[PDB]
Amino acid sequence: SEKLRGQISGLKRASLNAQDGISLLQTAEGGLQNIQDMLQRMRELAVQAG
Amino acid sequence: ILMVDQELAQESITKLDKALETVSGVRATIGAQINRLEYTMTGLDTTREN
Q1: What residues of chain A lie within 8 A of the CB of B47, using their CB?
Q2: Most CB atoms within 10 A, among A2, A10, A30, B22?
Q3: Which residue in B41, B39, B43 sits closest to A29, CA to CA?
Q4: d(Cα A32, Cα A34) in Å, to the nearest integer?
Q5: Is residue B26 classed as helix, strand or coil in its secondary structure?
């Protein structure tokens, strides 16, 4: 009983940690998307000249 | 700038051209800043969402 209780508690804590982790990557991909959006306008106005 | 005799018109045209170029340059700077701010608009909202 004691071992099973400990395992249940640990599994719950890991379940929380998973979403705690996922939020950070979501933020990172948002920032990267903004940067990628800017870079293409730079390239377009680059091919403008010449 | 004087328009009195038939000699100052040429200098007048030169000065007018130079002033026109100056005004165009200042307008270009204003447009550049406004576009940069418009681009920096959206990342703040995306970060707020995340």
Answers
A1: 27, 30-31
A2: A30
A3: B43
A4: 5
A5: helix
